[PDB]
Design a protein around this nucleic acid. Sequence first.
DNA 1: CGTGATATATAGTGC
DNA 2: GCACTATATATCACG
Lengths: 50, 50
Amino acid sequence: GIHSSVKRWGNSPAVRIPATLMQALNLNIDDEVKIDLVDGKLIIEPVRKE
Amino acid sequence: GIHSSVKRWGNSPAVRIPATLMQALNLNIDDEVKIDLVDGKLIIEPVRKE
DNA sequence: CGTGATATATAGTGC
DNA sequence: GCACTATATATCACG
């Protein structure tokens, strides 16, 4: 895919996610994504607060 | 795992990755991660260019 | 033409 | 206190 790079956000790094893709997963700003360690990779799953 | 708030980095959203997680997978700033779409979730895996 | 992306700074709070 | 969290701005590069 796109060769995007992870830059530093003030102090801690942040994975810049294309706003276009955010709409595909149906999530928005302030969303609580659950970072779980699976297969030695970062599984980012958006957890809705209903 | 750890739930993080996807805030707005300027105009684009970004998944904040705590330094604690950086040390875990031995990744750093200015690295390249493969943003894959599996299970309707964001698959973030560090793909070092070495 | 508009906003999505990049760079950057800061005050504050919980870990 | 430091990592972490929340917020705001200028400017461009891309759609």
